[PDB]
PDB file of C-alpha atoms in Angstrom:
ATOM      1  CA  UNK A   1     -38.115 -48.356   4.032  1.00  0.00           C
ATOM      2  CA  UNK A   2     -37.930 -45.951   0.388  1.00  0.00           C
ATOM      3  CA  UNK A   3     -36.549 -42.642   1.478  1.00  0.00           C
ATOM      4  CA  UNK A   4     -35.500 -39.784  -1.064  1.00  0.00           C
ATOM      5  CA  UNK A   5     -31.984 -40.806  -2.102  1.00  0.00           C
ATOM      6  CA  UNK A   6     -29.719 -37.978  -3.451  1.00  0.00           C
ATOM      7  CA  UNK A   7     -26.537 -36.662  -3.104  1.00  0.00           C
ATOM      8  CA  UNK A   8     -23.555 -39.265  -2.457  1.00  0.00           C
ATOM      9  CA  UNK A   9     -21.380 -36.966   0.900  1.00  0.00           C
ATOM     10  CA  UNK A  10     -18.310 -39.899   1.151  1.00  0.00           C
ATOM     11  CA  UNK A  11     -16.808 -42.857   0.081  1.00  0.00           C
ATOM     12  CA  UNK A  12     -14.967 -46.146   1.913  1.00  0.00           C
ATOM     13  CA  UNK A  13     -14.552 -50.259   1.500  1.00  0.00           C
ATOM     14  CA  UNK A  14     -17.404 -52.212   1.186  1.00  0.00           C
ATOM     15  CA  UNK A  15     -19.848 -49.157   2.235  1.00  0.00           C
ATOM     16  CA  UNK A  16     -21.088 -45.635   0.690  1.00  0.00           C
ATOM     17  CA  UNK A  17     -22.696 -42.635   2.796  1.00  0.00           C
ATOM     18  CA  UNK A  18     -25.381 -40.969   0.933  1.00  0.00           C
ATOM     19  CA  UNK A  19     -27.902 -38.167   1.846  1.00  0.00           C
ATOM     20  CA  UNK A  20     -31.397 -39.487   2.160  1.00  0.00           C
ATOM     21  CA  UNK A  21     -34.271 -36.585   3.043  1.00  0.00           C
ATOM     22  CA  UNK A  22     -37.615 -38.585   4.018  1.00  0.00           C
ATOM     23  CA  UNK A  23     -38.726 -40.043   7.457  1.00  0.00           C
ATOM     24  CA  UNK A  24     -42.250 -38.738   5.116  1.00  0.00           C
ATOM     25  CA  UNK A  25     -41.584 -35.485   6.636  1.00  0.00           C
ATOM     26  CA  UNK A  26     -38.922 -33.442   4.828  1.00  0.00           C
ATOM     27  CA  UNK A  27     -36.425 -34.449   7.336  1.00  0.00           C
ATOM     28  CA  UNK A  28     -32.782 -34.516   6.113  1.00  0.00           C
ATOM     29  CA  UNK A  29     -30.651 -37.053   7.281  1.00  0.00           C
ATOM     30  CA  UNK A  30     -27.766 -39.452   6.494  1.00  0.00           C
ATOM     31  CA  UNK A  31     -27.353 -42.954   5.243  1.00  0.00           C
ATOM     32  CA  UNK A  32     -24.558 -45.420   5.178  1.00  0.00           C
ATOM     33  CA  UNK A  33     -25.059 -48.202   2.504  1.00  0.00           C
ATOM     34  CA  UNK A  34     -23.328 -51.402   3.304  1.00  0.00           C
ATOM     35  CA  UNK A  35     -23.170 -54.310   1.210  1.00  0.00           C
ATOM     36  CA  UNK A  36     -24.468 -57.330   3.318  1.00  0.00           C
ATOM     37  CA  UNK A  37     -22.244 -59.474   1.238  1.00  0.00           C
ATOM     38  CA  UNK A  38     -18.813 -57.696   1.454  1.00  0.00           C
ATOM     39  CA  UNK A  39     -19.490 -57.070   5.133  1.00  0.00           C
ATOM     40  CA  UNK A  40     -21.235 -57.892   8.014  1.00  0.00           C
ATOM     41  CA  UNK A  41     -21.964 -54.366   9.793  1.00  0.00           C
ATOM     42  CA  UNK A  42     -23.227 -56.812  13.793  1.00  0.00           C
ATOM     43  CA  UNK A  43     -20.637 -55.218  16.048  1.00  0.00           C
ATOM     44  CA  UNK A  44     -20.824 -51.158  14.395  1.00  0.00           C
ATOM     45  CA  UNK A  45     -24.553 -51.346  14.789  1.00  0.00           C
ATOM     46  CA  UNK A  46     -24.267 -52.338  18.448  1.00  0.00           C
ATOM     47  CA  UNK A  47     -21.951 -50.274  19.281  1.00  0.00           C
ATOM     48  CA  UNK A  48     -24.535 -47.619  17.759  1.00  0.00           C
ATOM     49  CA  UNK A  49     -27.645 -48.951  19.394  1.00  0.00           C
ATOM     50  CA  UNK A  50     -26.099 -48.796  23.354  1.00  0.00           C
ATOM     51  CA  UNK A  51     -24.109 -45.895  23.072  1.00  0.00           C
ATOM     52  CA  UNK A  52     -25.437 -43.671  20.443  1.00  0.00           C
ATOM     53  CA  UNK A  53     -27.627 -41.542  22.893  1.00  0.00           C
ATOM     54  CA  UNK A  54     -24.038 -40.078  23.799  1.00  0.00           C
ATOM     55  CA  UNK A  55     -24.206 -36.425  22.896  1.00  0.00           C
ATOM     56  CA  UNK A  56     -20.860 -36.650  20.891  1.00  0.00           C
ATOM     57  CA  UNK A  57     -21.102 -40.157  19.378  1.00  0.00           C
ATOM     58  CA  UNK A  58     -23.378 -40.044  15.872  1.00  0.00           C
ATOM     59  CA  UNK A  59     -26.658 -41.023  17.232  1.00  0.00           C
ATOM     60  CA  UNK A  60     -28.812 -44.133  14.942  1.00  0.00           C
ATOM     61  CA  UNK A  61     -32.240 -43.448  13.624  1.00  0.00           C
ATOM     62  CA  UNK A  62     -33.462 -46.404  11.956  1.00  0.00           C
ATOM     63  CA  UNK A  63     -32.108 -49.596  10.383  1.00  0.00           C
ATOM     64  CA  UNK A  64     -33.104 -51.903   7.695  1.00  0.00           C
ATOM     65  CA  UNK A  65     -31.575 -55.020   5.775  1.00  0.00           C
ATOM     66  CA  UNK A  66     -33.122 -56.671   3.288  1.00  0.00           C
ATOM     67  CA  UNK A  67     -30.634 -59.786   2.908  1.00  0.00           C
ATOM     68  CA  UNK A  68     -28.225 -57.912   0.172  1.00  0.00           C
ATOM     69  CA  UNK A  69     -27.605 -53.974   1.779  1.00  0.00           C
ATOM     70  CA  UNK A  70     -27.748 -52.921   5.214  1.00  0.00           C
ATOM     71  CA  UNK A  71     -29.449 -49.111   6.025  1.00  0.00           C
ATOM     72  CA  UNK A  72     -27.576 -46.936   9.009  1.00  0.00           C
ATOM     73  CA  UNK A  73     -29.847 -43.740   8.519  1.00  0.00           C
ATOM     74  CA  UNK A  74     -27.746 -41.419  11.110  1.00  0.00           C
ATOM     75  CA  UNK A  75     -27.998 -37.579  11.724  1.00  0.00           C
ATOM     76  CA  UNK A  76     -26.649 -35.755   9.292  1.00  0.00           C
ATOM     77  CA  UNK A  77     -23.258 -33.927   9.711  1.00  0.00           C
ATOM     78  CA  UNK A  78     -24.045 -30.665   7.630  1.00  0.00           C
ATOM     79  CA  UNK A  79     -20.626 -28.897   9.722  1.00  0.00           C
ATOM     80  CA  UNK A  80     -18.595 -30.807   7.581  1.00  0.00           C
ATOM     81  CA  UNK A  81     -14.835 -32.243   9.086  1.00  0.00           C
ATOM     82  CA  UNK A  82     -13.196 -30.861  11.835  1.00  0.00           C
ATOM     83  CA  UNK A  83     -10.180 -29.417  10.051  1.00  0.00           C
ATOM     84  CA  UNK A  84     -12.490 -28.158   7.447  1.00  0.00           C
ATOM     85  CA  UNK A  85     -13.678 -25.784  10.275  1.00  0.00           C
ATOM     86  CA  UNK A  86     -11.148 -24.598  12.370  1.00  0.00           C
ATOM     87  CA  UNK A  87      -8.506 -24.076   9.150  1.00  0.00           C
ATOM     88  CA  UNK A  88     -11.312 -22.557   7.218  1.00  0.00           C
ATOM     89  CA  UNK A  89     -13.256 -19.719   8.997  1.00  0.00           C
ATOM     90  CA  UNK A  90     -13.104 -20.066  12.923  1.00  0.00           C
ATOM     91  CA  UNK A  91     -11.254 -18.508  15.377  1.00  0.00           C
ATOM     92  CA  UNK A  92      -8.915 -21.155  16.386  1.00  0.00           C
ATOM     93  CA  UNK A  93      -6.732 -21.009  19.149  1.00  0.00           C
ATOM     94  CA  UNK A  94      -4.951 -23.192  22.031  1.00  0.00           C
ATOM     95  CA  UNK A  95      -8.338 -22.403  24.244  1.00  0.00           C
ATOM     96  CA  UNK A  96     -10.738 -23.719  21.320  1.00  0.00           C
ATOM     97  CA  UNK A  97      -8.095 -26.319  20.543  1.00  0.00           C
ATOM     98  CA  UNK A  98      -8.492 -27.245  24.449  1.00  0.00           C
ATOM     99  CA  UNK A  99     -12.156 -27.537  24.415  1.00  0.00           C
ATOM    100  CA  UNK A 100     -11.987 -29.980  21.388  1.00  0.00           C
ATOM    101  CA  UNK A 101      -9.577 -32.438  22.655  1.00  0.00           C
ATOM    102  CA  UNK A 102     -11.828 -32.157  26.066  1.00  0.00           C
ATOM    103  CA  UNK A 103     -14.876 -32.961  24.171  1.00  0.00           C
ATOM    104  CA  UNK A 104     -13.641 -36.265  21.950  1.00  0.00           C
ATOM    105  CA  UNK A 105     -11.123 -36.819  24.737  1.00  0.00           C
ATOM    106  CA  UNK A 106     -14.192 -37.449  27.378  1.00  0.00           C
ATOM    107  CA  UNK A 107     -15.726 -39.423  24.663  1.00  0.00           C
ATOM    108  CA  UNK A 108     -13.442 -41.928  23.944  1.00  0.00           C
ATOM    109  CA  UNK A 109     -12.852 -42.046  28.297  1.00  0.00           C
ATOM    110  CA  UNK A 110     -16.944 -43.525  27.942  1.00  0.00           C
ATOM    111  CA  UNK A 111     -15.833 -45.983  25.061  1.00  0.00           C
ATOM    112  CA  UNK A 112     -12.568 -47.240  26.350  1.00  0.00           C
ATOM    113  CA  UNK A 113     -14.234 -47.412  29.988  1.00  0.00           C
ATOM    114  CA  UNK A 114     -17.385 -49.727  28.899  1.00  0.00           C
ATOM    115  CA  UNK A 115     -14.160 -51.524  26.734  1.00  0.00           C
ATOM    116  CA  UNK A 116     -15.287 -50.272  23.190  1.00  0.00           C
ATOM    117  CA  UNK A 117     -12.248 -49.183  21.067  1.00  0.00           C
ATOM    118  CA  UNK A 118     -12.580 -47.274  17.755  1.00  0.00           C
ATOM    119  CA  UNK A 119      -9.400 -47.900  15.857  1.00  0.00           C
ATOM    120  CA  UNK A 120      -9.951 -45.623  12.848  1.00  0.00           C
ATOM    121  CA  UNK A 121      -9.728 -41.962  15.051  1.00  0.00           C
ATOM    122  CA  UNK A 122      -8.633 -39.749  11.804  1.00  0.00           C
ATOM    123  CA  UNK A 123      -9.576 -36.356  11.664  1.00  0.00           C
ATOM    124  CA  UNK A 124     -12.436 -36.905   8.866  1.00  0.00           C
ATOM    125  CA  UNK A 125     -14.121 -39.279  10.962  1.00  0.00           C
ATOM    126  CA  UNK A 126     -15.193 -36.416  13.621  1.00  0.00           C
ATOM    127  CA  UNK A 127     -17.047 -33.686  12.406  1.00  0.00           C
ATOM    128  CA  UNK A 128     -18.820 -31.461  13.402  1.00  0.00           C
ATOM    129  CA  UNK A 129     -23.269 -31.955  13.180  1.00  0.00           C
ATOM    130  CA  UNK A 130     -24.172 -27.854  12.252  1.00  0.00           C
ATOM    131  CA  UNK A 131     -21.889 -24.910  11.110  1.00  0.00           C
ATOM    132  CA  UNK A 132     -21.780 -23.374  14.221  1.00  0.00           C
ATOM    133  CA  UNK A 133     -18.014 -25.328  14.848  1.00  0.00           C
ATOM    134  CA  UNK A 134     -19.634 -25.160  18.821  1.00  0.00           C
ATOM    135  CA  UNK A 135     -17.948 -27.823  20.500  1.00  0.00           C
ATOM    136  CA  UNK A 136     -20.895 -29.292  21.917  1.00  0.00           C
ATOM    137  CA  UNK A 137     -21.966 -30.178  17.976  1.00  0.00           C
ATOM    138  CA  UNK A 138     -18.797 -32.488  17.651  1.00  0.00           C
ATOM    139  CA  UNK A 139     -19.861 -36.351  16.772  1.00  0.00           C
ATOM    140  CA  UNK A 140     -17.486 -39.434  16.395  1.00  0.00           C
ATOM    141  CA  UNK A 141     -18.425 -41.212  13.689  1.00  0.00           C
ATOM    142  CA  UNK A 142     -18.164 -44.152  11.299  1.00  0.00           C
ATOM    143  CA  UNK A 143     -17.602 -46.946  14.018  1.00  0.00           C
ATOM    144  CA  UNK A 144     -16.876 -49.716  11.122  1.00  0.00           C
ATOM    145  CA  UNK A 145     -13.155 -50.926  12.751  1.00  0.00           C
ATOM    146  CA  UNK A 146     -14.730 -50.432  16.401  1.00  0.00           C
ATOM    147  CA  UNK A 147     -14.711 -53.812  18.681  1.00  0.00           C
ATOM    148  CA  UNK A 148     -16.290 -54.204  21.629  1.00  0.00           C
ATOM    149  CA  UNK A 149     -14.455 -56.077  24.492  1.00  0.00           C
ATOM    150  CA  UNK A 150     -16.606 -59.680  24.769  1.00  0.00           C
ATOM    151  CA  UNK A 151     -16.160 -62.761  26.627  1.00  0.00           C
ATOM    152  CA  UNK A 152     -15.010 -66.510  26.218  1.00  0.00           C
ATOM    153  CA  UNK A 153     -18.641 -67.149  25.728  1.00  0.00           C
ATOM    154  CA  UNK A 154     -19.404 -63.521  24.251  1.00  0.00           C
ATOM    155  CA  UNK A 155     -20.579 -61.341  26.676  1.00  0.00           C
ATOM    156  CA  UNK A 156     -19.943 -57.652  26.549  1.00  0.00           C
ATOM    157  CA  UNK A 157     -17.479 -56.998  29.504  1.00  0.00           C
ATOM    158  CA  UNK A 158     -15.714 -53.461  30.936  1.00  0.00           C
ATOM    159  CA  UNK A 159     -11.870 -53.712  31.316  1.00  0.00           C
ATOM    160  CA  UNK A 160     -13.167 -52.770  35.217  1.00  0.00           C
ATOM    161  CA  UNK A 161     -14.455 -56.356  35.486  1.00  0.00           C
ATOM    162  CA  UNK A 162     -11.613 -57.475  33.044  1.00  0.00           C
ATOM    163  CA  UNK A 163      -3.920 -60.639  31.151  1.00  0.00           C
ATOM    164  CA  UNK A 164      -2.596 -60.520  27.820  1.00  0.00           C
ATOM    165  CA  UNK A 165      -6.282 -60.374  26.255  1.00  0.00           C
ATOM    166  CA  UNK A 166      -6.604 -57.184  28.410  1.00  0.00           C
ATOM    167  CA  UNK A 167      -3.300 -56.208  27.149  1.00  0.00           C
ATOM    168  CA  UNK A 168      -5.072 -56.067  23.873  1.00  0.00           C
ATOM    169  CA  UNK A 169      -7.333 -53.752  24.730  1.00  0.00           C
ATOM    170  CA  UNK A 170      -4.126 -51.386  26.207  1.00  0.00           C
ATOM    171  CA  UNK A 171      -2.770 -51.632  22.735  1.00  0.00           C
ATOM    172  CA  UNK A 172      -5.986 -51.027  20.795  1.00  0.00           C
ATOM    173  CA  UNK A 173      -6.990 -47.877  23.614  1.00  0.00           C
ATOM    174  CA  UNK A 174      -3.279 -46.316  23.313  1.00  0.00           C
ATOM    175  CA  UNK A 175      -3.500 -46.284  19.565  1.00  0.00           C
ATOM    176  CA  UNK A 176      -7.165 -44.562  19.893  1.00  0.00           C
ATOM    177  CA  UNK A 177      -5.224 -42.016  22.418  1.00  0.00           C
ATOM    178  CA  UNK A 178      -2.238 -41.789  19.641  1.00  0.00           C
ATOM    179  CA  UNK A 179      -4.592 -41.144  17.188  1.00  0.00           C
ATOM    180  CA  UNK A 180      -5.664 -38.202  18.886  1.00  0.00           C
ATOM    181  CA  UNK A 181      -2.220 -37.113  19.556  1.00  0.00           C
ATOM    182  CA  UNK A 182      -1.647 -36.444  15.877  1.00  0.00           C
ATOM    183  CA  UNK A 183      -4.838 -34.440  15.638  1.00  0.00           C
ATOM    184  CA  UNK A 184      -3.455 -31.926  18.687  1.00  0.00           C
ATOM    185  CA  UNK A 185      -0.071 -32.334  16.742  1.00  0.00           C
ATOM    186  CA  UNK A 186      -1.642 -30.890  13.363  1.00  0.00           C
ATOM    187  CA  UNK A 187      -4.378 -28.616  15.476  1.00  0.00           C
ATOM    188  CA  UNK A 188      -1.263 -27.068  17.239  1.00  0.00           C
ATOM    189  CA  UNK A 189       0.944 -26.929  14.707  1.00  0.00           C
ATOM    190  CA  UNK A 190      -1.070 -26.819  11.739  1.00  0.00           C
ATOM    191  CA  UNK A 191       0.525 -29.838  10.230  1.00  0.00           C
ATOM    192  CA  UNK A 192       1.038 -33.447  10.176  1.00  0.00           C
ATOM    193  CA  UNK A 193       3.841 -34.677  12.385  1.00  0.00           C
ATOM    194  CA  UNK A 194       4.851 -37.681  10.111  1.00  0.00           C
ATOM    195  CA  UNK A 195       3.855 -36.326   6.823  1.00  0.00           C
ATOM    196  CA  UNK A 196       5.147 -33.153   5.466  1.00  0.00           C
ATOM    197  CA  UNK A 197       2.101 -33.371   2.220  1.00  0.00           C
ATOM    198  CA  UNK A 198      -0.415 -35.599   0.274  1.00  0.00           C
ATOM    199  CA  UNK A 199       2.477 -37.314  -1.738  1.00  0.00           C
ATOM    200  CA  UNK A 200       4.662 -39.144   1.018  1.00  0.00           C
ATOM    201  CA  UNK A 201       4.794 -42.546   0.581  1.00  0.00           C
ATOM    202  CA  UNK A 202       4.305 -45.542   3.419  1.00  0.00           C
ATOM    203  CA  UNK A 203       8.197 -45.895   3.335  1.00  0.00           C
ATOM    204  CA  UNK A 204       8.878 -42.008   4.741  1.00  0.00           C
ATOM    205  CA  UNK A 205       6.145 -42.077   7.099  1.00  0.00           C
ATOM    206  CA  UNK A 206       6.164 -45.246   8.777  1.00  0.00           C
ATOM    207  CA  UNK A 207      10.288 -44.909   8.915  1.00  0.00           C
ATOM    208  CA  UNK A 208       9.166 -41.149  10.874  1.00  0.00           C
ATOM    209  CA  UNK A 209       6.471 -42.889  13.287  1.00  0.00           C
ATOM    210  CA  UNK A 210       8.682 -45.333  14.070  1.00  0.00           C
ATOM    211  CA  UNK A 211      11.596 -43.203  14.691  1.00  0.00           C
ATOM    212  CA  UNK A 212       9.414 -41.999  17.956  1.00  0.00           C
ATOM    213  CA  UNK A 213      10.455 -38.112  16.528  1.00  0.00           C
ATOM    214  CA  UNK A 214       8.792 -35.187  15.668  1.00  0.00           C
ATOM    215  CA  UNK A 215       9.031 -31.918  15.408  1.00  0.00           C
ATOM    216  CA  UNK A 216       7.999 -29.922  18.979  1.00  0.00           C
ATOM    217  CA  UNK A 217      10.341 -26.753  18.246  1.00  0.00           C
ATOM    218  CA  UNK A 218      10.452 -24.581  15.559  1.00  0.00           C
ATOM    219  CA  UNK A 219       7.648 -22.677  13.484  1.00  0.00           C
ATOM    220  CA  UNK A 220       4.160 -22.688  15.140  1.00  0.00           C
ATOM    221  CA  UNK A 221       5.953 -24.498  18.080  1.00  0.00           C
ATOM    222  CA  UNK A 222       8.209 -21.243  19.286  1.00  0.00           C
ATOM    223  CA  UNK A 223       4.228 -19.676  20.292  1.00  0.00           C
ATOM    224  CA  UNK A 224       2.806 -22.640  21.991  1.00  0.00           C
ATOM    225  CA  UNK A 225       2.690 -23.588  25.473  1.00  0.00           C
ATOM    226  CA  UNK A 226       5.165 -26.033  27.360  1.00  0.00           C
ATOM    227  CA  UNK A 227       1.746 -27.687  29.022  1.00  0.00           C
ATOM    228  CA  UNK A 228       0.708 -28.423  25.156  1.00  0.00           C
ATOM    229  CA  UNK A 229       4.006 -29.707  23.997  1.00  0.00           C
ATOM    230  CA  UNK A 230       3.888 -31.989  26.971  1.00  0.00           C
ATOM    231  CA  UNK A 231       0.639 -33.624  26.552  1.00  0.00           C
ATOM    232  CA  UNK A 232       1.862 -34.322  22.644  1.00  0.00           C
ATOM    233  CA  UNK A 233       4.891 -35.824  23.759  1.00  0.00           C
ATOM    234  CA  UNK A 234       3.028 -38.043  26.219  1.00  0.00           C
ATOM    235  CA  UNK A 235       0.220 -38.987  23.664  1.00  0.00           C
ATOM    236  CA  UNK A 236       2.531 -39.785  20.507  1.00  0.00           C
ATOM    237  CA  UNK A 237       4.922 -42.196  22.919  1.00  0.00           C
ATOM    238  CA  UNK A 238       6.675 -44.804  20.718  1.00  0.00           C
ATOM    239  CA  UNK A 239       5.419 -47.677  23.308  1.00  0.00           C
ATOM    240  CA  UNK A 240       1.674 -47.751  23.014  1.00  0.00           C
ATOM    241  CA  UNK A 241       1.619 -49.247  26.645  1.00  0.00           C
ATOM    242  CA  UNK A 242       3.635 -46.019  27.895  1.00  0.00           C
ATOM    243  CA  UNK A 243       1.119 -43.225  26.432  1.00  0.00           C
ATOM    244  CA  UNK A 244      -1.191 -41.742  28.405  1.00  0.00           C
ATOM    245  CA  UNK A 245      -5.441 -43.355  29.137  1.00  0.00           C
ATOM    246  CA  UNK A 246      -7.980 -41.174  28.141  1.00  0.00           C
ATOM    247  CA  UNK A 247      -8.472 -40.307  32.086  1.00  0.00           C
ATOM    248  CA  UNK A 248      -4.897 -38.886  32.349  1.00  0.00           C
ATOM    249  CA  UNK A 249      -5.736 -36.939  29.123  1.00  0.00           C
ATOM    250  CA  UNK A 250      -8.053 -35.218  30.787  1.00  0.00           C
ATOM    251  CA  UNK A 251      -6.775 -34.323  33.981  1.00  0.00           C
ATOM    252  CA  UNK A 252      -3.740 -33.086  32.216  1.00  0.00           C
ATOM    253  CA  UNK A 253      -3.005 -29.276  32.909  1.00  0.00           C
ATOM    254  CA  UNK A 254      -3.736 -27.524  29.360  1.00  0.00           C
ATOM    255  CA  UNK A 255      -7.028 -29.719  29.539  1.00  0.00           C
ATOM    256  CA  UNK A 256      -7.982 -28.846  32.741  1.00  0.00           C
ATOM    257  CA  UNK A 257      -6.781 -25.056  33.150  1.00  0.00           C
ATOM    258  CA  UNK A 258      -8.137 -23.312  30.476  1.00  0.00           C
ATOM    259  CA  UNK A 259      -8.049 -20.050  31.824  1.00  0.00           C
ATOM    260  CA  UNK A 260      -3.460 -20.453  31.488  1.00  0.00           C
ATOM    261  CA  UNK A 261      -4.087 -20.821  28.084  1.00  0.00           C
ATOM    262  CA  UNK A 262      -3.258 -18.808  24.741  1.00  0.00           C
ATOM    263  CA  UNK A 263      -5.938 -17.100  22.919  1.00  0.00           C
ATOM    264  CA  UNK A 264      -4.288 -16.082  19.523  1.00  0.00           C
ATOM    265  CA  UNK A 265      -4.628 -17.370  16.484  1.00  0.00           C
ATOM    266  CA  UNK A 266      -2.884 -20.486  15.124  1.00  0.00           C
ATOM    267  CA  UNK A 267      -1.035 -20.665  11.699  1.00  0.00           C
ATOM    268  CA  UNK A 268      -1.875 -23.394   9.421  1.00  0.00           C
ATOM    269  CA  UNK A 269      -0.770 -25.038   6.041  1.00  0.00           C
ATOM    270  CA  UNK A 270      -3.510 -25.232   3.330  1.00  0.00           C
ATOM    271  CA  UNK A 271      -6.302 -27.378   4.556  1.00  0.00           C
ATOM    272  CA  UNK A 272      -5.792 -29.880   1.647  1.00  0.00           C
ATOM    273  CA  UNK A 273      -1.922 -30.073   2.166  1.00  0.00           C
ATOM    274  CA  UNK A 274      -2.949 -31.175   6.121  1.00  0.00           C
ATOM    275  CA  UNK A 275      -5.802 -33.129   4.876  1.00  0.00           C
ATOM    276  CA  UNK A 276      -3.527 -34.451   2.548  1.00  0.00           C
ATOM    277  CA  UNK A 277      -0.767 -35.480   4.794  1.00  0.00           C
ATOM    278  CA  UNK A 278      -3.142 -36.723   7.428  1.00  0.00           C
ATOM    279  CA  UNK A 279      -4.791 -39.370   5.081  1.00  0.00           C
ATOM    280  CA  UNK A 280      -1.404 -40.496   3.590  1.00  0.00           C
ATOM    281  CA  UNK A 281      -0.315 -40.998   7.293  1.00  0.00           C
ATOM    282  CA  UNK A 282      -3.176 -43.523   7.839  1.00  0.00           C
ATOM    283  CA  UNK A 283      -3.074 -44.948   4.364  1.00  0.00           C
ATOM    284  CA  UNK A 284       0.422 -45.834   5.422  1.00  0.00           C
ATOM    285  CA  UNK A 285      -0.737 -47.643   8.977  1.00  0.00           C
ATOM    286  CA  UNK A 286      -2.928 -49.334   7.318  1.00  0.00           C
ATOM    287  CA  UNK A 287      -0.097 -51.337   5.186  1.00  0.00           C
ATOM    288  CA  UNK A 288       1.204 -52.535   8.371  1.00  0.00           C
TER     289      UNK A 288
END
């Protein structure tokens, strides 16, 4: 139950992620500290325990609670954020852009097909689990405003089994597929589509999302492919019931035909300008 407790990695409500180096064998890992008081961490620790074995979804080690702080000891993610990656030091181009939708895009297809939604998809909540930025080492993480799709009487249930309290679940799945929209938006054009920087406030950007607009000419946009301003357009729909399932995602041309696509190098803003923008853009979804 005592590890080695060191380094603090992140920050959120009612939880802190620290890096803990024990298992009485040297082995590094990471721990999410949540206070058993402020919240009650039942449905993200499920969610964990049956579908954490996926290869892309941050696997559990152990788990403790001793009444007043709960003890998620995951795998740690020494690659650090996606966008700290590819608009750092990584060849980055529509093909590698391709095979990271594919791989979070399949993902969330398992999670929105055994009717689990995640409903906090922001860029800094998939990162990559060793510096190699090798698709394959991508993990979804931090499944704290995840639900799982229950019953009257609470059992778990698939939307195959599963009318307006499936209509729920269409909402809560096209906002996990618009969330992903804006991170092909900003890996495309190396920017935020709503936010233009760090210092926008919830009035600009919500007025911009809700304007159902966005920039798909111009800049980085003149080099990229009609098949990837398509698949934008179609996952950033105003109507969250009119975007696109995870499925139709990935049997969408620049998905599936990688061999069509661009290989050069994508322009991008400075990473903390995009990280900037992006975290303004959810601070500002968050109000409503």
């Amino acid at each position: 139950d005592g590890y080695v407790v060191k380094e603090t990695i992140g920050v959120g409500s009612y939880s802190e992620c620290k890096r803990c180096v024990h298992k009485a064998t040297n082995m590094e890992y990471a721990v999410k500290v949540i206070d058993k008081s402020k919240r009650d961490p039942s449905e993200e620790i499920e969610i964990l325990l049956r579908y954490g074995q996926h290869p892309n979804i941050i696997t559990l080690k152990d788990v403790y609670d001793d009444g007043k702080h709960v003890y998620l000891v995951t795998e740690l993610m020494r690659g650090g954020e996606l966008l700290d990656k590819i608009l750092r030091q990584k060849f980055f181009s529509e093909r590698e852009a391709s095979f990271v939708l594919h791989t979070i895009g399949k993902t969330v297809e398992y999670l929105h097909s055994q009717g689990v939604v995640h409903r906090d998809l922001k860029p800094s909540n998939i990162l990559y689990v060793d510096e190699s930025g090798n698709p394959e080492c991508l993990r979804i993480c931090d499944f704290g405003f995840a639900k799982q799709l229950r019953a009257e009487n609470g059992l778990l249930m698939t939307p195959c089994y599963t009318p307006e309290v499936l209509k729920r679940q269409g909402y809560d799945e096209g906002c996990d597929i618009w969330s992903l929209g804006i991170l092909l938006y900003t890996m495309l054009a190396g920017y935020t589509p709503f936010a233009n920087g760090p210092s926008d406030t919830p009035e600009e950007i919500l007025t911009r999302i809700g304007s159902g607009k966005f920039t798909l000419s111009g800049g980085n946009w003149n080099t990229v492919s009609e098949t990837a301003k398509d698949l934008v357009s179609k996952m950033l729909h105003v109507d969250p019931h009119q975007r696109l399932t995870a499925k139709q995602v990935l049997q969408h041309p620049w998905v599936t035909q990688k061999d069509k696509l661009p290989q050069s190098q994508l322009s991008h803003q400075d990473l903390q300008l995009v990280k900037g923008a992006m975290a303004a853009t959810y601070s500002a979804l968050n109000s409503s």
